[PDB]
Protein: Ectoine hydroxylase
Amino acid sequence: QDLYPSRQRADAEMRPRLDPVVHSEWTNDAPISARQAAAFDRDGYIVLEDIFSADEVAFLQKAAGNLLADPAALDADTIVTEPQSNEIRSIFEIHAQSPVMARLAADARLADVARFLLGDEVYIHQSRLNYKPGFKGREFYWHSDFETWHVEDGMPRMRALSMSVLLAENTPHNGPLMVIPGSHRTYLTCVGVPDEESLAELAHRHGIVAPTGKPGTVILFDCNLMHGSNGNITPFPRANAFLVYNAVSNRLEKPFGVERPWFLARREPAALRVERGPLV
Structure:
C-alpha cells in the first residue's frame, strides 16, 4: 500500500527504488539510442541538444518573454513572485494557459521520449515557466521531486519524469541545475528536506554534475533524482520551461501523508495527444 513512506519517523533512511527507471524494452523503433536509454537508467538524466531549430528556439524565447513581461491574461493563482515583491519568478500550468507551451509539451521530440521512458501514454502532471534573475538569483536546495509528489500529491510510483527546456543559456557560473547522478535509485525518506549526512553520503558516492547548454537544450530527469542549484550573482539570467510527464497508469491517489492547490499537481487524466512538425 505504501512503497515509499516518508515524513513518518524522526530518523531518515535510504530505501531501495522498487520501480524501473526505463519502463520500456529498447528497440530500433525507440526515439533514443540504446546508449541514451542506458545512460538515463544508470544516471537518471540525459541531455538532448540541437533538437529544435534556431527559429523554433527564438520563438519559444519570445513566447516566454511575453508571458513573463505581461502576465495579465494568466490566472493570478498560478504566479509565484519574489517574496516581498511583485516580480515574477514562476508561472505554473503554462501548458494549460499558453498555446505555444501546450504545443511544446505535445511535441513528439519531447512527448515520444516520455512515452518510451515511462512505457505508457503520458499526461502533464505539472508545468512551470521559471525566471531566475541575474545578481540576486536564489538557490534551490536539494530535493527529490518524487518525495513531494508522493507524500503531498499521492503519486504512487516512480514513473514520472521532468524535462527542462533551456530558454536562456546555462553556464557553469549562473547557478545551473546540479544533480547527483545515480541518486534516483535511492529513495531518501525525509524526517520534507533531505538531511545533510545522507546528502554527503550520496554526493561522495556519486559526485555532482551540472548540465549546461544553449537555449533549446533539454535536460531530462527521473522524478526521484536528487537535484538543486546554487544562487546566481552573475548578470546572466536563467530561464526554462519545466514540463513534468507522468504515465496515465501512475495517476494520483490520496496523498501519502496529509500534506495541495490545483496548479501544483493535476488530480482520471486523459492522454496527451502528440504533435509532429515544426513549432513555427
Summary: Helices lie at 34-43, 54-69, 94-97, 99-106, 108-118, 145-153, 196-206. The longest helix spans residues 54-69. DSSP finds seven helices and twelve strands in the chain.
